From Swiss-Prot, chain C:
Component of the large ribosomal subunit. Interacts with DHX33. Induction: Up-regulated in silica-treated macrophages. It comes from Mus musculus. This is Large ribosomal subunit protein uL24. It comes from the Eukaryota. The gene is Rpl26. GO terms for biological process: cellular response to ionizing radiation; cytoplasmic translation; DNA damage response, signal transduction by p53 class mediator; positive regulation of intrinsic apoptotic signaling pathway in response to DNA damage by p53 class mediator; translation at postsynapse; translation at presynapse.
Curated annotation (Swiss-Prot), chain D:
The modification Phosphoserine is found at S26. One of its GO terms (cellular component) is presynapse. This is Large ribosomal subunit protein uL29. There is a cross-link at K22 (Glycyl lysine isopeptide (Lys-Gly) (interchain with G-Cter in SUMO2)). Belongs to the universal ribosomal protein uL29 family. GO terms for biological process: cytoplasmic translation; maturation of LSU-rRNA from tricistronic rRNA transcript (SSU-rRNA, 5.8S rRNA, LSU-rRNA); translation at postsynapse; translation at presynapse. The lineage of its organism: Eukaryota, Metazoa, Chordata, Craniata, Vertebrata. Component of the large ribosomal subunit. The ribosome is a large ribonucleoprotein complex responsible for the synthesis of proteins in the cell. The keyword Acetylation applies.
From Swiss-Prot, chain G:
It is found in: Cytoplasm; Nucleus. The N-terminal beta-like import receptor binding (BIB) domain mediates interaction with IPO5, IPO7, KPNB1 and TNPO1. Component of the large ribosomal subunit. Interacts with LYAR and GNL2. Interacts with MDM2; this interaction may promote MDM2-mediated p53/TP53 polyubiquitination. Directly interacts (via BIB domain) with IPO5, IPO7, KPNB1 and TNPO1; these interactions are involved in RPL23A nuclear import for the assembly of ribosomal subunits. Interacts with IPO8. The chain holds residues 98 to 156 of 156 of the full protein. This is Large ribosomal subunit protein uL23. It comes from Mus musculus (Mouse). The gene is Rpl23a. Belongs to the universal ribosomal protein uL23 family.
UniProtKB/Swiss-Prot annotation, chain H:
The lineage of its organism: Eukaryota, Metazoa, Chordata, Craniata, Vertebrata. Component of the large ribosomal subunit. Interacts with IMPACT. InterPro entries: Ribosomal_eL39, Ribosomal_eL39_CS, Ribosomal_eL39_dom_sf. This is Large ribosomal subunit protein eL39. Disulfide bonds: none annotated. It holds the Pfam family Ribosomal_L39. It is found in: Cytoplasm. Coiled coil: none annotated. GO terms for biological process: antibacterial humoral response; antimicrobial humoral immune response mediated by antimicrobial peptide; cytoplasmic translation; defense response to Gram-positive bacterium; innate immune response in mucosa. Keywords: Cytoplasm, Ribonucleoprotein, Ribosomal protein. GO terms for molecular function: structural constituent of ribosome. The keyword Nucleotidyltransferase does not apply. It comes from Mus musculus. It comes from the Eukaryota. Belongs to the eukaryotic ribosomal protein eL39 family.
Amino acid sequence: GRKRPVPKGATYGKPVHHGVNQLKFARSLQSVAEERAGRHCGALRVLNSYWVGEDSTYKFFEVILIDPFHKAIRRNPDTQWITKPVHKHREMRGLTSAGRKSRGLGKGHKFHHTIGGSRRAAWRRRNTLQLHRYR
Amino acid sequence: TKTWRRWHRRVNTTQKRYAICSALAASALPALVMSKGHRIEEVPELPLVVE
Amino acid sequence: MKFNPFVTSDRSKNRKRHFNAPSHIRRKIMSSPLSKELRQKYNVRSMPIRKDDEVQVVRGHYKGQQIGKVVQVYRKKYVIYIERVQREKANGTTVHVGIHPSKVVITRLKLDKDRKKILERKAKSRQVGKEKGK
Amino acid sequence: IKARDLRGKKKEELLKQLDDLKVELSQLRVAKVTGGAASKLSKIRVVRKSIARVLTVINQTQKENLRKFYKGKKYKPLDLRPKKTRAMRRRLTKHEEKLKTKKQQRKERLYPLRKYAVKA
Amino acid sequence: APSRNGMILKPHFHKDWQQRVDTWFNQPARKIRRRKARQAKARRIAPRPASGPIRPIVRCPTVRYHTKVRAGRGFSLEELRVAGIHKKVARTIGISVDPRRR
Amino acid sequence: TKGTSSFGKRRNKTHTLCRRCGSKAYHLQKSTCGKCGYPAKRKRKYNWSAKAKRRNTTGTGRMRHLKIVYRRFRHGFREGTTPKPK
Amino acid sequence: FIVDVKANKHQIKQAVKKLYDIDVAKVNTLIRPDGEKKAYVRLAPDYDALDVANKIGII
Amino acid sequence: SSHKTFRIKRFLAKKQKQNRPIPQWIRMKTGNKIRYNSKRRHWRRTKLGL
RNA sequence: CGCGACCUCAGAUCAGACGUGGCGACCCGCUGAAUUUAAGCAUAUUAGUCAGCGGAGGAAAAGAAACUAACCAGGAUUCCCUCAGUAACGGCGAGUGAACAGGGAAGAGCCCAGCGCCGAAUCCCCGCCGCGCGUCGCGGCGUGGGAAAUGUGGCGUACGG
RNA sequence: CCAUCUAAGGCUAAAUACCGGCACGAGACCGAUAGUCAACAAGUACCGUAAGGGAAAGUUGAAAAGAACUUUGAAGGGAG
RNA sequence: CGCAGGUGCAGAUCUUGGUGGUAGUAGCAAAUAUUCAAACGAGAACUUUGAAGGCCGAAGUGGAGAAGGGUUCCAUGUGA
RNA sequence: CGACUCUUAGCGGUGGAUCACUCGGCUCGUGCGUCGAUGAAGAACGCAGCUAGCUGCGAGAAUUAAUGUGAAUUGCAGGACACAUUGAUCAUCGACACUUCGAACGCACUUGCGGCCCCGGGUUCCUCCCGGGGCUACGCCUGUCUGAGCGUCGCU
Ligand SMILES: [Zn+2]
């Protein structure tokens, strides 16, 4: 899990925010594997990742990367999308398959917190006061 | 001062049509038109109609 | 009334453009009317003032029928200097009095290839407009 | 001196003219520190701008010759290959942008968009 | 706070609403821009109807609205087949297609 | 003792001029800038100081490259061509 | 002379020799509080500083 | 002190050269608004940022 | 126990490329208080908000149902009106609080992996020639290298093929 | 029992957003103690070791025609 | 005649600026001390030269450096 | 008688209110919507005949070239431009040029110290001295070369 990085375990404030020890990260262990591969290999594009192994202390994943400036990639129309600038660091924006799972998006009644594209998008829409010209 | 002050007013369509009818009726009375300072003399007919 | 949505009628914007206009825009701003005889010869109403132009002053203290020669076009000050339009300082020396070119009338214009070319352009454009109206 | 008159000249005489201008400019700066005439001080601006004019012609001719030499070569110096914007140099060329898969081409040929109207 | 008779009001102004206020002074501007987009699109597809493809007749799915009929997303594969129109040529003709309608 | 007497001992210098931002905020013993965080690759910037950002944002300096880019954008970033000769 | 700040004694000696056709014995260098570099160029015994100064025009 | 670096000396050189009074002909320029150098710095009164 | 092949690794100022930093109003992923209200206060509220971190684009994100509904059924996403201060949550206190249907703005759909058939049909690089040539694509040839059977390409993806 | 869809792979324009940037237009807004801190050599002068803090300050006259010359005073400053 | 407000000040130890009485008042009292003559000069208790009388009394009121200052160093001129 | 004090008015002054003005703001709206290892943003230091600051610029430094324009710039001076054997000024701006730091890039942040390959001058293949030029950062992709392994094997 995620231990809160507070000195001596002292979260100053109200008791509801005193938790230090049984807190959990919002993103999966697979997402942080993709994020660490992308940060090191800045010139590459994270495509996807999968599980390979597991220990009591470590989890092992394998990440697929695409060199977006190789001619075999940007001469093939079926893979020219990864070369577009809007697909830089998908792993850091939660656009890979592992990253999307933590965002809580989908279709139907289980997913209404992200009914406008994201949690922040939905929050902003229902927390903005519409003042028309004719009120 | 804030931009979301109410700047605009909506009037009922029937009342807006009422105001136009009243304005048209008054425009045909020479006393009311002269009371606006519109120098209507030597004008042959106040409801002036030209081809 | 102006209809162009890209032309400003704003006071501050029009004054700002006038007062820090570049030199070549100050040239056309400092235009003066041609004489009645010159307007009859060339079908042109006004020309930008230029050095060695013979003008007469029609407004101000130095108005008259005297013809003088433009000796300086101080575009930064938006004034021109004429031969006889002058006064005396306290010391005794003589200084020119700046006259805005909108207050003078050109009686003879210095003629060269560039001046003939823009005289013909202004006459051709006006003649086209008269024909279009007719 | 005029730039257009310098273009019909060889590199050696352009270098000779540049040398005479620098020698003259050195002489004028001597006059500046020894209380020289106002006519000599005003010539410093003139001679300085001629040196710029000559060096402009030499540099422009040299760059033009390099562009002609590297024309058609697969690899050019970074000084010569076009400078637009880092982002535009990353983007796909016009040819690869219009490349289509055989599946896409079949779709366009078999079911093209049609021009049609509906009567009232 | 309360003074004699009144309504127990619960206004939702406890959440720093002044940072998120949507004013509609650009409403007339977005009507002209939407209108000019329609006119440009109509010219670009000039002979075509400029109102989109033909939509099917659809019944509204609830007791409150099952007496009314509106336009659907597209003609289903079953009605396209009975009419004898290929599902890959309907879009070119100007026929909307909804493969997921029963 | 604290006060005027203690101010007489002020003869050292905790900070020196910085080689990246130019302010006298380069700590000598820590070898780091309190204004821009120079040895760090990213500049020091915070949202709690809106005044601080405005002092050192884009547009406060020459903008040697950016001002030509603004001019060049108006013509499509053309290059390799010259106007027609006389 | 006043010389460029990015100029050492070897460059100063070679330059003075090149444009004035004189031999240099030694060069001493100073940076003034104005910011410019001052060079004290002692000439060879064969050459006379006053004659060189006349030809340059500083006197 | 006498012991100073090149960077500091060049910094002091610039402040020395910019501590001069306004030239007299500037007052005669058309549309002039400067009457004196308001950025004059005295060594004893105001100390340098260094 | 020398010479080969493959595998897994290493070094190179090797030939070509690519990333870093800035701006950050709008956008995406995290992390994340307390002042305040409750006339005290701890849950709650403030608030998934301020501050902190990372990543972009002219938009971003989302997106073509493991959907809604229960009807005589609708039919990707996004936005506006309404639903609605409602269903629901809450020391059921203070307070918080959506969605479906309906009307509009816009409207557009598609692709693999898998299962198969086709003598790897496929791709990168390097030369030469015919070209074309605004700063680079085409055809051939290569008794030219490499990748790829630990699977490239063509057909085909739930609406079936 | 019925209804509905086919997860754990992928791409996609438009309608939507925009207190930064480049150009524009306008206003029942303010009119130099106001309006941006900043109409002016303003994020300047100056202050703090530093993070940071941060001003005051517009108007001769249409045109300098900005008072030549005489006179008292060492001059500032006066009288003509 | 109507329309719309950032629409009326004696107070807020109110904010910014300006000004009084106090008041020609307090004060210009820490470390012994000045005098005569001359020069320059419009002008001298205070500058300079000379002659007297005194002080620091080598852990100095001396001669040099380090930090720090940054042109304060030197010459000439001015006396706002 | 004065003086002094108080009040009022006239005139004169320590003062800068009021009024009039505004190349400034603020707000709304529209169109675009573009930085950077080909070195950005931001700093530093320089550059004018006389020029401190602001501004503009970079050793070609208050600007070169090119195109358009068509007789100025201006505070003083000086000399262009004979105002077509084609051009002052200004604007535009596609050519050229663009010092030192800075993601900052040979190592290091002191005008410190290198290395490899070339060029010129002293001597002559000491590369010994001086000057100049090109390279010399991290990560990472495809390919290339050189390798390692009691890794798996084959021929010996
Ligand atoms: Zn710094």
